[PDB]
Design an enzyme around this catalytic site. Sequence first.
Site, PDB file in Angstrom:
ATOM      1  N   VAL A   1      44.387 113.303   6.902  1.00 35.69           N
ATOM      2  CA  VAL A   1      45.179 112.086   6.713  1.00 35.69           C
ATOM      3  C   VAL A   1      44.300 110.888   6.330  1.00 35.69           C
ATOM      4  CG1 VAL A   1      46.988 112.891   8.313  1.00 35.69           C
ATOM      5  CG2 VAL A   1      45.221 111.338   9.156  1.00 35.69           C
ATOM      6  N   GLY A   2      43.036 110.917   6.759  1.00 35.30           N
ATOM      7  CA  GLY A   2      42.106 109.807   6.532  1.00 35.30           C
ATOM      8  C   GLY A   2      40.650 110.134   6.812  1.00 35.30           C
ATOM      9  N   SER A   3      39.759 109.278   6.311  1.00 29.83           N
ATOM     10  CA  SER A   3      38.312 109.454   6.458  1.00 29.83           C
ATOM     11  C   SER A   3      37.581 108.110   6.420  1.00 29.83           C
ATOM     12  CB  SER A   3      37.775 110.382   5.364  1.00 29.83           C
ATOM     13  OG  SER A   3      36.380 110.601   5.512  1.00 29.83           O
TER      14      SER A   3
ATOM     15  N   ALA B   1      33.916 105.742   8.104  1.00 33.65           N
ATOM     16  CA  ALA B   1      32.891 105.572   9.134  1.00 33.65           C
ATOM     17  C   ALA B   1      33.529 105.634  10.517  1.00 33.65           C
ATOM     18  CB  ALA B   1      32.153 104.256   8.941  1.00 33.65           C
ATOM     19  N   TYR B   2      34.812 105.293  10.577  1.00 35.15           N
ATOM     20  CA  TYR B   2      35.600 105.439  11.797  1.00 35.15           C
ATOM     21  C   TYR B   2      35.878 106.909  12.120  1.00 35.15           C
ATOM     22  CZ  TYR B   2      36.981 100.701  13.285  1.00 35.15           C
ATOM     23  OH  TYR B   2      37.003  99.428  13.806  1.00 35.15           O
TER      24      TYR B   2
ATOM     25  N   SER C   1      36.567 111.019  10.359  1.00 33.97           N
ATOM     26  CA  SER C   1      37.653 111.632   9.603  1.00 33.97           C
ATOM     27  C   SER C   1      38.740 112.145  10.541  1.00 33.97           C
ATOM     28  CB  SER C   1      37.128 112.751   8.701  1.00 33.97           C
ATOM     29  OG  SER C   1      36.151 113.531   9.366  1.00 33.97           O
ATOM     30  N   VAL C   2      39.991 111.949  10.135  1.00 35.58           N
ATOM     31  CA  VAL C   2      41.150 112.301  10.949  1.00 35.58           C
ATOM     32  C   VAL C   2      42.019 113.346  10.248  1.00 35.58           C
ATOM     33  CG1 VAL C   2      43.173 111.413  12.218  1.00 35.58           C
ATOM     34  CG2 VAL C   2      41.146 109.970  11.951  1.00 35.58           C
TER      35      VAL C   2
ATOM     36  N   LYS D   1      40.547 113.315  15.538  1.00 38.65           N
ATOM     37  CA  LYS D   1      39.448 112.585  14.908  1.00 38.65           C
ATOM     38  C   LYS D   1      38.122 113.280  15.168  1.00 38.65           C
ATOM     39  CE  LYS D   1      38.887 107.905  15.240  1.00 38.65           C
ATOM     40  NZ  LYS D   1      38.340 106.608  15.738  1.00 38.65           N
TER      41      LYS D   1
ATOM     42  N   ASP E   1      42.873 101.548  18.212  1.00 39.71           N
ATOM     43  CA  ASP E   1      41.608 100.923  17.793  1.00 39.71           C
ATOM     44  C   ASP E   1      41.104  99.742  18.638  1.00 39.71           C
ATOM     45  OD1 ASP E   1      40.808 102.729  15.778  1.00 39.71           O
ATOM     46  OD2 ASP E   1      42.100 101.752  14.286  1.00 39.71           O
TER      47      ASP E   1
HETATM   48  C1  LIG Z   1      42.763 110.657  16.793  1.00 42.30           C
HETATM   49  C2  LIG Z   1      42.450 109.235  17.270  1.00 42.30           C
HETATM   50  C3  LIG Z   1      41.232 108.970  17.905  1.00 42.30           C
HETATM   51  C4  LIG Z   1      40.937 107.675  18.345  1.00 42.30           C
HETATM   52  C5  LIG Z   1      41.860 106.639  18.156  1.00 42.30           C
HETATM   53  C6  LIG Z   1      41.572 105.200  18.644  1.00 42.30           C
HETATM   54  O1  LIG Z   1      42.430 104.321  18.538  1.00 42.30           O
HETATM   55  N1  LIG Z   1      40.370 105.003  19.189  1.00 42.30           N
HETATM   56  C7  LIG Z   1      39.927 103.703  19.719  1.00 42.30           C
HETATM   57  C8  LIG Z   1      40.670 103.221  20.967  1.00 42.30           C
HETATM   58  C9  LIG Z   1      39.243 103.752  21.087  1.00 42.30           C
HETATM   59  C10 LIG Z   1      43.077 106.914  17.533  1.00 42.30           C
HETATM   60  C11 LIG Z   1      43.377 108.204  17.086  1.00 42.30           C
HETATM   61  N2  LIG Z   1      44.553 108.447  16.497  1.00 42.30           N
HETATM   62  C12 LIG Z   1      44.837 108.168  15.219  1.00 42.30           C
HETATM   63  C13 LIG Z   1      43.852 107.722  14.328  1.00 42.30           C
HETATM   64  C14 LIG Z   1      44.180 107.438  13.000  1.00 42.30           C
HETATM   65  O2  LIG Z   1      43.310 107.044  12.223  1.00 42.30           O
HETATM   66  N3  LIG Z   1      45.508 107.603  12.548  1.00 42.30           N
HETATM   67  C15 LIG Z   1      45.820 107.290  11.125  1.00 42.30           C
HETATM   68  C16 LIG Z   1      46.497 108.058  13.456  1.00 42.30           C
HETATM   69  C17 LIG Z   1      46.152 108.336  14.773  1.00 42.30           C
HETATM   70  C18 LIG Z   1      47.276 108.732  15.370  1.00 42.30           C
HETATM   71  N4  LIG Z   1      48.259 108.700  14.465  1.00 42.30           N
HETATM   72  N5  LIG Z   1      47.803 108.332  13.377  1.00 42.30           N
HETATM   73  C19 LIG Z   1      48.542 108.154  12.280  1.00 42.30           C
HETATM   74  C20 LIG Z   1      48.823 109.176  11.367  1.00 42.30           C
HETATM   75  C21 LIG Z   1      49.602 108.883  10.244  1.00 42.30           C
HETATM   76  C22 LIG Z   1      50.091 107.588  10.038  1.00 42.30           C
HETATM   77  F1  LIG Z   1      50.841 107.285   8.961  1.00 42.30           F
HETATM   78  C23 LIG Z   1      49.805 106.577  10.946  1.00 42.30           C
HETATM   79  C24 LIG Z   1      49.035 106.863  12.062  1.00 42.30           C
HETATM   80  F2  LIG Z   1      48.762 105.871  12.935  1.00 42.30           F
END
Ligand SMILES: Cc1ccc(C(=O)NC2CC2)cc1Nc1cc(=O)n(C)c2c1cnn2-c1ccc(F)cc1F
EC number: 2.7.11.24
Length: 352
Positions: free
Chosen positions: A30-32, A34-35, A37-38, A53, A168
């Site tokens: 879904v994404g990549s 420096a944060y 890759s997800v 992630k 985040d």
């Molecule tokens: C796996 C993970 C690991 C860590 C953190 C976090 O907030 N870490 C900080 C607090 C310490 C968040 C996630 N979860 C997502 C990360 C992400 O980049 N996306 C895009 C996510 C996630 C959950 N859903 N989605 C998601 C998918 C499709 C979309 F259209 C829209 C979305 F939000």
Amino acid sequence: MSQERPTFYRQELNKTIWEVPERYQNLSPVGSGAYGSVCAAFDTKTGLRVAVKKLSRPFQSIIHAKRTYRELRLLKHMKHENVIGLLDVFTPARSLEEFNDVYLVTHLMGADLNNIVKCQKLTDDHVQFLIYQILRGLKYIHSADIIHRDLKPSNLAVNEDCELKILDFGLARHTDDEMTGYVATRWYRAPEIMLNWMHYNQTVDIWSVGCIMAELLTGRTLFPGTDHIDQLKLILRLVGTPGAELLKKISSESARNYIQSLTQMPKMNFANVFIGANPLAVDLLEKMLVLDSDKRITAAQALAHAYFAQYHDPDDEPVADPYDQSFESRDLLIDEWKSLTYDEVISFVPPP
Ligand SMILES: Cc1ccc(C(=O)NC2CC2)cc1Nc1cc(=O)n(C)c2c1cnn2-c1ccc(F)cc1F
């Protein structure tokens, strides 16, 4: 006494190798960045759509190692409906020696607020419910003495029935270049942190909520400055120039000195700005967008505001357990941060 290692399988997505337990199926990028890759996945054990992630070589430096630990500690702490939480954490590594990859698993969300604010045209009830959930999550986050520090529509995630989670928190670390110019990365930031007026606190996140709420109500960015100074001028036009009492709170002599050079302006009438909006929404906005951070409404106070009368439930707005933040002031080597992280990975207990 003990815990069992699951069976892992390997799989390449966009030139990166993912090694995950068998329970996770149908991995899709879904994404990549420096944060990390997800990928989206289906968890067969719980029946949950999940986001995974991958942090690859999260121990290449001291700052990376500490950030990896920080993120994991943050995610492990949060247990709230409106805050992203840790469903699972794993590594394919069998020992500390081979441990060089960290995977974090959360609920999969449908869209962020940027994506929805477009596909749709939001009603006042939509705004009520979305902002209520942000403040509900923020009350929880702030009660653990955690500051988000970078609240914006892109880290507010939403599903189809308008249920919201905050992502985040506690981990944003932007470069100067990323904050420069006509950029959404800066538009939601409180003035005191944008120009480093003073040592900031949690009141910084409430400013961001006011900006988000205004945007949801109008469909327009509240302070879309072309630079730091243009944005400040946009802010001061609406909320007025600082009074004497706030000026002495600005510990930065250079910043206080710049403020005093500006033509003084009164606070605008918010009813003449947000025309046709619910007067209760306007009132709350006035209490969120206060220049003096000490005088801003808190998350807990805002939940009790009349604007949220149909959603507010004081028995269903929990606070968090204490968050031990003492590691932040600690100076350690890479292998020390790595060992701490490894301990947190293996000590993880899955949610009920
Ligand atoms: C796996 C993970 C690991 C860590 C953190 C976090 O907030 N870490 C900080 C607090 C310490 C968040 C996630 N979860 C997502 C990360 C992400 O980049 N996306 C895009 C996510 C996630 C959950 N859903 N989605 C998601 C998918 C499709 C979309 F259209 C829209 C979305 F939000």
